[PDB]
Amino acid sequence: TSDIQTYTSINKYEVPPAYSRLPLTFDFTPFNNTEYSGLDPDVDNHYTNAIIQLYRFIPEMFNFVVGCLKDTTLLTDLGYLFDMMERSHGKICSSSNFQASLKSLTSIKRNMPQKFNRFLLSQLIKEEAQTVNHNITLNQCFGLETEIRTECSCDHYDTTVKLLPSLSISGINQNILPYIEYAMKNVTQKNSICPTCGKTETITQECTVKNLPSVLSLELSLLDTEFSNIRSSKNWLTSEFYGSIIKNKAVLRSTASELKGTSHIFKYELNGYVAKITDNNNETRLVTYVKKYNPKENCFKWLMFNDYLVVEITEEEALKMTYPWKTPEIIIYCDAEELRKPFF
Ligand SMILES: [Zn+2]
């Protein structure tokens, strides 16, 4: 017999109590002894709660969103929500209102967490645009400047530059750094019909991310076979790394000095991630790992959120990818200095 907040087991195949499917939702205090609020799972699309928690713990993000309340829209709803979650004392909060706003805009399936992540960021960034203020903060925080050049025979496929708020990660050909590097610079081929010519042709496209934004939001979009190689790789989920734009390419390394012939080096730290838990029943759910700075003790602590259960955990557990019941879904890296700023 174990307390529900027990978050390890001996055998890697047994889902520990803290990760289990919690009772339907009335006291939740036995599930949470922290000062951080969990979310009521009795809402539509309750898997979005894991992603709401994730963003709630990005300082640049929290602070900007709650700041808007001092100026209707699911930005401001997210504002009210974040604010309730901070000042509530670990008391449960509801994403009810936020869910409503989302709906108005008319089992965890493959890609749905990633799809919701892209939608949410894009939607927040667009609303941020709707203020005649400027009012760029989210755009500049998450914005990946992505250039697509096309080698083609017909001279049409004009180069495009779009600002994307997240980076989609697919397989390469071990740790996470080369995956991110590949997503930020790659050359691919595909069959295509030219919108201008109508010619069908194999085109070659070079996709280049131009900048290293202060928040990198990663959507893992891998095959389950690729996930099996991730679990076998110890230390796949790198906790911190250094990046630089070197010769029009993003280069990412574990240490700063591995970065050569570049004049500006940026440090990133893992802030949090959302993971899918798969039960023995094959029942499925999202949890959230986050890292929060305690500037008095000059250290970070790691928290795991499972709906309304919240438990402080070791960094070892927080970075462990080897559990067959665990799959990373969405990962956030954050400028190391930003990560230490206070939540207002
Ligand atoms: Zn053409």
Short mmCIF file of C-alpha atoms and ligand atoms in Angstrom, two decimals:
data_model
loop_
_atom_site.label_atom_id
_atom_site.label_comp_id
_atom_site.label_asym_id
_atom_site.label_seq_id
_atom_site.Cartn_x
_atom_site.Cartn_y
_atom_site.Cartn_z
CA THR A 1 0.00 0.00 0.00
CA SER A 2 1.26 3.39 -1.16
CA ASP A 3 0.18 7.03 -0.92
CA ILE A 4 -1.37 8.34 -4.14
CA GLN A 5 1.45 10.88 -4.36
CA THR A 6 4.04 8.13 -4.68
CA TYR A 7 5.61 8.83 -8.09
CA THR A 8 8.12 5.96 -8.50
CA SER A 9 7.78 2.18 -8.59
CA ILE A 10 10.47 -0.50 -8.59
CA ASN A 11 9.70 -1.97 -12.01
CA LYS A 12 9.85 0.32 -15.05
CA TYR A 13 6.63 -1.25 -16.49
CA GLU A 14 4.36 -0.28 -13.55
CA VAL A 15 2.72 3.08 -13.72
CA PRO A 16 3.30 4.70 -10.30
CA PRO A 17 0.31 5.98 -8.24
CA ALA A 18 0.92 9.69 -8.94
CA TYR A 19 0.68 8.98 -12.70
CA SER A 20 -2.45 6.85 -12.47
CA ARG A 21 -5.99 7.68 -13.58
CA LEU A 22 -7.40 9.66 -10.68
CA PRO A 23 -10.90 9.36 -9.35
CA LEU A 24 -13.63 11.31 -11.14
CA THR A 25 -14.35 14.67 -9.55
CA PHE A 26 -14.83 17.21 -2.44
CA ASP A 27 -11.27 17.32 -1.11
CA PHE A 28 -8.29 17.33 -3.39
CA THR A 29 -5.81 18.23 -0.63
CA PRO A 30 -4.71 14.55 -0.35
CA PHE A 31 -3.52 14.88 -3.99
CA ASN A 32 -1.57 18.11 -3.59
CA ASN A 33 0.64 19.39 -0.76
CA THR A 34 2.21 22.14 -2.87
CA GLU A 35 1.29 25.79 -3.31
CA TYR A 36 0.65 25.23 -7.03
CA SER A 37 -2.90 24.69 -8.18
CA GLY A 38 -4.01 21.69 -10.25
CA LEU A 39 -6.80 21.78 -12.79
CA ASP A 40 -10.26 20.25 -12.62
CA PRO A 41 -10.34 17.38 -15.12
CA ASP A 42 -14.17 17.63 -15.41
CA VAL A 43 -14.03 19.89 -18.46
CA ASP A 44 -14.29 19.15 -22.17
CA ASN A 45 -10.90 18.47 -23.79
CA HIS A 46 -9.40 18.14 -20.35
CA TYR A 47 -6.13 17.06 -21.94
CA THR A 48 -5.61 20.76 -22.73
CA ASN A 49 -5.14 21.29 -18.93
CA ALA A 50 -1.71 19.70 -19.14
CA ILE A 51 -0.74 22.30 -21.78
CA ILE A 52 -2.25 25.18 -19.86
CA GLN A 53 -0.02 24.14 -16.89
CA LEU A 54 2.96 24.02 -19.16
CA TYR A 55 2.58 27.61 -20.30
CA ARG A 56 1.60 28.78 -16.84
CA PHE A 57 5.19 28.02 -15.82
CA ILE A 58 7.00 29.93 -18.56
CA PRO A 59 7.82 33.24 -16.92
CA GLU A 60 7.83 35.37 -20.04
CA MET A 61 4.54 33.81 -21.01
CA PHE A 62 2.82 33.99 -17.58
CA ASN A 63 3.88 37.53 -17.04
CA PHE A 64 2.78 38.80 -20.38
CA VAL A 65 -0.62 37.10 -20.27
CA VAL A 66 -1.54 38.17 -16.75
CA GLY A 67 -0.32 41.67 -17.57
CA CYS A 68 -2.98 41.99 -20.24
CA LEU A 69 -5.73 41.76 -17.62
CA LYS A 70 -4.94 45.38 -16.75
CA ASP A 71 -6.07 46.53 -20.25
CA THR A 72 -13.61 39.24 -24.19
CA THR A 73 -10.83 37.03 -25.59
CA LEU A 74 -9.16 33.72 -24.65
CA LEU A 75 -5.94 35.59 -24.13
CA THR A 76 -7.59 37.46 -21.27
CA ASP A 77 -9.36 34.29 -20.14
CA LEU A 78 -6.00 32.61 -20.01
CA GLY A 79 -4.93 35.72 -18.07
CA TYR A 80 -7.64 35.29 -15.43
CA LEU A 81 -6.84 31.59 -15.28
CA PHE A 82 -3.07 31.96 -14.79
CA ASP A 83 -3.73 34.59 -12.17
CA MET A 84 -6.20 32.43 -10.26
CA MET A 85 -3.67 29.53 -10.45
CA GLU A 86 -0.77 31.58 -9.04
CA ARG A 87 -2.57 33.23 -6.11
CA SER A 88 -4.72 30.26 -5.22
CA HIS A 89 -2.82 28.35 -2.64
CA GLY A 90 -2.65 25.07 -4.43
CA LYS A 91 -6.47 25.14 -4.39
CA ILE A 92 -7.99 23.64 -7.51
CA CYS A 93 -8.84 25.91 -10.41
CA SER A 94 -11.14 25.39 -13.41
CA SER A 95 -10.41 25.91 -17.09
CA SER A 96 -14.16 26.07 -17.66
CA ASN A 97 -14.31 29.69 -18.94
CA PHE A 98 -11.21 29.17 -21.13
CA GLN A 99 -12.77 25.97 -22.55
CA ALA A 100 -15.89 27.96 -23.38
CA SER A 101 -13.95 30.64 -25.24
CA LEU A 102 -12.10 27.96 -27.18
CA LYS A 103 -15.31 26.14 -28.12
CA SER A 104 -16.90 29.37 -29.38
CA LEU A 105 -14.16 29.24 -31.99
CA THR A 106 -15.93 26.26 -33.58
CA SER A 107 -8.26 8.78 -25.36
CA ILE A 108 -5.40 11.09 -26.42
CA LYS A 109 -5.21 10.78 -30.24
CA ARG A 110 -1.93 10.91 -32.11
CA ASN A 111 -0.92 14.49 -32.78
CA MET A 112 -3.81 16.15 -30.89
CA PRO A 113 -1.65 17.60 -28.11
CA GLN A 114 0.73 18.99 -30.80
CA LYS A 115 -2.19 20.26 -32.84
CA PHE A 116 -3.64 22.04 -29.80
CA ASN A 117 -0.22 23.52 -28.95
CA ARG A 118 0.14 25.11 -32.45
CA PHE A 119 -3.44 26.41 -32.39
CA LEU A 120 -3.13 27.92 -28.97
CA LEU A 121 0.09 29.77 -29.63
CA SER A 122 -1.10 31.00 -33.02
CA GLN A 123 -4.41 32.10 -31.61
CA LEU A 124 -2.77 33.96 -28.70
CA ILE A 125 -0.34 35.63 -31.07
CA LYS A 126 -3.17 36.70 -33.38
CA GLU A 127 -5.20 38.16 -30.51
CA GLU A 128 -2.09 39.99 -29.35
CA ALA A 129 -2.08 41.52 -32.85
CA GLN A 130 -5.67 42.72 -32.47
CA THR A 131 -4.54 45.35 -29.91
CA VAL A 132 -3.56 48.56 -31.79
CA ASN A 133 -0.82 48.72 -29.14
CA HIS A 134 2.45 47.14 -30.36
CA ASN A 135 2.36 44.67 -28.34
CA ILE A 136 4.79 42.23 -29.97
CA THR A 137 5.90 40.36 -26.87
CA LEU A 138 4.53 36.82 -27.62
CA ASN A 139 5.46 37.00 -31.26
CA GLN A 140 9.03 37.93 -30.34
CA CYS A 141 9.14 35.37 -27.54
CA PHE A 142 8.08 32.26 -29.51
CA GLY A 143 8.59 33.42 -33.11
CA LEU A 144 10.72 31.17 -35.31
CA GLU A 145 11.56 32.97 -38.56
CA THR A 146 11.28 30.20 -41.10
CA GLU A 147 12.52 30.60 -44.67
CA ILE A 148 11.55 28.07 -47.37
CA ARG A 149 13.49 28.21 -50.63
CA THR A 150 12.45 26.07 -53.56
CA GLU A 151 14.62 24.65 -56.30
CA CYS A 152 12.27 24.05 -59.23
CA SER A 153 12.31 24.00 -63.07
CA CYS A 154 9.55 26.56 -63.69
CA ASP A 155 10.89 29.61 -61.81
CA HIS A 156 7.75 30.14 -59.71
CA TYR A 157 7.98 28.83 -56.21
CA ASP A 158 8.84 32.17 -54.58
CA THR A 159 10.81 32.10 -51.39
CA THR A 160 8.62 32.44 -48.33
CA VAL A 161 9.38 33.62 -44.84
CA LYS A 162 6.82 32.87 -42.16
CA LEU A 163 6.94 33.42 -38.38
CA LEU A 164 5.99 30.20 -36.66
CA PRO A 165 5.47 29.92 -32.87
CA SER A 166 6.50 26.28 -32.49
CA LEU A 167 8.90 23.87 -34.08
CA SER A 168 7.75 20.50 -35.30
CA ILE A 169 10.20 17.71 -34.55
CA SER A 170 10.30 14.58 -36.70
CA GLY A 171 12.81 11.79 -37.09
CA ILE A 172 16.42 12.25 -38.21
CA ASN A 173 18.97 9.98 -39.98
CA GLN A 174 21.75 10.11 -29.02
CA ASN A 175 19.84 13.07 -27.58
CA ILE A 176 17.32 15.68 -28.59
CA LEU A 177 19.80 18.34 -29.93
CA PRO A 178 20.27 16.95 -33.50
CA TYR A 179 16.47 16.60 -33.77
CA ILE A 180 16.02 20.28 -33.09
CA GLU A 181 18.98 21.15 -35.35
CA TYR A 182 17.42 19.11 -38.18
CA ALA A 183 14.04 20.86 -37.76
CA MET A 184 15.80 24.23 -37.95
CA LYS A 185 17.73 23.41 -41.15
CA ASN A 186 16.84 20.70 -43.68
CA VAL A 187 16.54 19.97 -47.41
CA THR A 188 13.68 17.79 -48.60
CA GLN A 189 12.18 16.68 -51.88
CA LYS A 190 8.56 16.22 -52.86
CA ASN A 191 6.21 15.91 -55.75
CA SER A 192 4.31 19.04 -56.41
CA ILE A 193 1.92 20.78 -58.77
CA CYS A 194 2.86 24.39 -59.36
CA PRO A 195 -0.03 26.76 -58.53
CA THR A 196 1.17 29.10 -61.29
CA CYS A 197 2.35 26.65 -64.03
CA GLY A 198 0.33 23.56 -63.20
CA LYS A 199 3.47 21.53 -63.88
CA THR A 200 3.94 18.42 -61.81
CA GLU A 201 7.50 18.09 -60.66
CA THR A 202 9.84 16.90 -57.90
CA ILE A 203 10.97 20.01 -56.10
CA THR A 204 13.68 20.46 -53.54
CA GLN A 205 13.03 22.77 -50.58
CA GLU A 206 15.46 24.16 -48.09
CA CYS A 207 13.85 25.06 -44.79
CA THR A 208 15.88 27.42 -42.62
CA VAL A 209 15.01 28.81 -39.18
CA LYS A 210 16.78 32.13 -38.96
CA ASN A 211 16.67 32.96 -35.25
CA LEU A 212 16.87 31.53 -31.75
CA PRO A 213 13.88 32.85 -29.88
CA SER A 214 13.78 33.07 -26.05
CA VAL A 215 11.16 30.34 -25.88
CA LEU A 216 11.43 27.25 -28.02
CA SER A 217 8.23 25.30 -28.10
CA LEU A 218 8.82 21.79 -29.58
CA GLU A 219 6.14 19.47 -30.90
CA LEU A 220 7.29 15.90 -31.12
CA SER A 221 5.86 14.33 -34.19
CA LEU A 222 7.67 11.03 -34.31
CA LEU A 223 6.81 7.48 -35.18
CA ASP A 224 6.32 5.15 -32.24
CA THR A 225 9.32 3.21 -33.52
CA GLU A 226 11.36 6.39 -33.23
CA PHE A 227 10.05 6.84 -29.68
CA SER A 228 11.44 3.39 -28.82
CA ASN A 229 14.93 4.61 -29.71
CA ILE A 230 14.40 7.67 -27.56
CA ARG A 231 13.58 5.49 -24.52
CA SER A 232 16.66 3.38 -25.08
CA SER A 233 18.78 6.50 -25.21
CA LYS A 234 19.76 7.58 -21.76
CA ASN A 235 19.73 11.34 -21.29
CA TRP A 236 17.86 11.98 -24.49
CA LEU A 237 15.97 14.91 -22.94
CA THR A 238 18.87 17.35 -22.54
CA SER A 239 18.35 19.65 -19.57
CA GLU A 240 20.38 22.53 -20.92
CA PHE A 241 22.27 23.51 -24.09
CA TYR A 242 23.86 26.33 -26.02
CA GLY A 243 22.83 27.60 -29.40
CA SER A 244 24.17 29.91 -32.01
CA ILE A 245 23.32 30.95 -35.58
CA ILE A 246 26.51 30.04 -37.40
CA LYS A 247 26.69 30.64 -41.18
CA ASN A 248 22.91 30.90 -41.57
CA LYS A 249 22.42 27.69 -39.63
CA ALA A 250 21.26 27.02 -36.04
CA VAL A 251 23.94 24.97 -34.27
CA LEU A 252 23.10 23.43 -30.90
CA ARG A 253 25.59 21.82 -28.50
CA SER A 254 25.77 20.55 -24.91
CA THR A 255 28.56 22.92 -23.96
CA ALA A 256 29.26 26.49 -25.05
CA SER A 257 32.81 25.88 -26.22
CA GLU A 258 31.70 23.29 -28.81
CA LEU A 259 30.29 26.28 -30.72
CA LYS A 260 32.94 27.62 -33.11
CA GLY A 261 33.44 30.75 -35.15
CA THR A 262 30.40 32.50 -33.80
CA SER A 263 30.11 35.72 -31.91
CA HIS A 264 26.84 35.25 -29.95
CA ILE A 265 25.96 32.18 -27.94
CA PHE A 266 22.61 31.66 -26.20
CA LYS A 267 21.85 29.28 -23.33
CA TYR A 268 18.66 27.31 -23.17
CA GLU A 269 17.26 25.34 -20.25
CA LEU A 270 14.45 22.85 -20.16
CA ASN A 271 11.45 24.65 -18.55
CA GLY A 272 8.92 21.87 -18.86
CA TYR A 273 7.21 19.33 -21.04
CA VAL A 274 3.97 17.49 -21.50
CA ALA A 275 4.05 13.73 -21.58
CA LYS A 276 1.58 11.06 -22.48
CA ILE A 277 1.11 8.31 -19.98
CA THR A 278 -0.08 4.99 -21.30
CA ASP A 279 -1.59 2.61 -18.71
CA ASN A 280 -1.40 -1.13 -18.71
CA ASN A 281 -5.13 -0.93 -19.66
CA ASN A 282 -3.86 1.21 -22.55
CA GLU A 283 -5.84 4.03 -21.04
CA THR A 284 -4.15 7.23 -21.84
CA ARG A 285 -3.55 10.67 -20.28
CA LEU A 286 -1.39 13.78 -20.24
CA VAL A 287 0.84 15.00 -17.47
CA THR A 288 3.05 18.05 -17.18
CA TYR A 289 6.57 18.44 -15.84
CA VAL A 290 7.76 21.89 -14.91
CA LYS A 291 10.79 23.50 -13.40
CA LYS A 292 10.34 26.55 -11.15
CA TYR A 293 13.08 28.76 -9.86
CA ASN A 294 13.42 29.45 -6.13
CA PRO A 295 15.71 32.48 -6.06
CA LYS A 296 16.06 32.41 -2.23
CA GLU A 297 17.59 28.92 -2.26
CA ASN A 298 19.30 29.59 -5.62
CA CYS A 299 17.76 26.44 -7.08
CA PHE A 300 15.05 24.89 -9.18
CA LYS A 301 12.43 22.41 -8.12
CA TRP A 302 10.60 20.05 -10.45
CA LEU A 303 6.84 19.51 -10.28
CA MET A 304 4.67 16.86 -11.95
CA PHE A 305 1.02 17.73 -12.58
CA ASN A 306 -1.57 14.96 -13.21
CA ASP A 307 -4.87 16.83 -13.38
CA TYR A 308 -5.45 17.82 -9.74
CA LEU A 309 -2.52 15.84 -8.33
CA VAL A 310 0.66 17.87 -7.99
CA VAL A 311 3.86 16.44 -6.64
CA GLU A 312 7.38 17.77 -6.16
CA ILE A 313 9.88 15.44 -7.82
CA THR A 314 13.56 14.94 -8.37
CA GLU A 315 15.27 16.24 -11.46
CA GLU A 316 16.28 12.62 -12.11
CA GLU A 317 12.62 11.64 -12.45
CA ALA A 318 11.87 14.80 -14.36
CA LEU A 319 14.51 13.96 -17.06
CA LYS A 320 13.90 10.21 -17.22
CA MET A 321 12.69 9.05 -20.68
CA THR A 322 13.17 5.36 -20.28
CA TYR A 323 9.71 4.39 -18.97
CA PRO A 324 7.77 2.35 -21.54
CA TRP A 325 4.57 4.02 -20.25
CA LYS A 326 5.90 7.55 -20.88
CA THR A 327 6.11 9.49 -24.17
CA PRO A 328 7.20 13.11 -24.50
CA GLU A 329 4.71 15.16 -26.54
CA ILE A 330 5.53 18.85 -26.11
CA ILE A 331 8.81 20.26 -24.84
CA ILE A 332 9.72 23.83 -23.82
CA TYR A 333 13.21 25.21 -23.70
CA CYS A 334 13.68 28.70 -22.41
CA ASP A 335 16.49 31.23 -22.30
CA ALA A 336 18.28 30.31 -19.07
CA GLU A 337 18.26 33.84 -17.61
CA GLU A 338 14.58 34.43 -18.47
CA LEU A 339 13.66 31.24 -16.68
CA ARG A 340 14.85 32.69 -13.40
CA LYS A 341 12.79 35.90 -13.58
CA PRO A 342 9.98 36.21 -11.06
CA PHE A 343 6.34 35.67 -11.82
CA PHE A 344 4.60 39.02 -11.28
ZN ZN B 1 5.37 26.87 -62.12
#
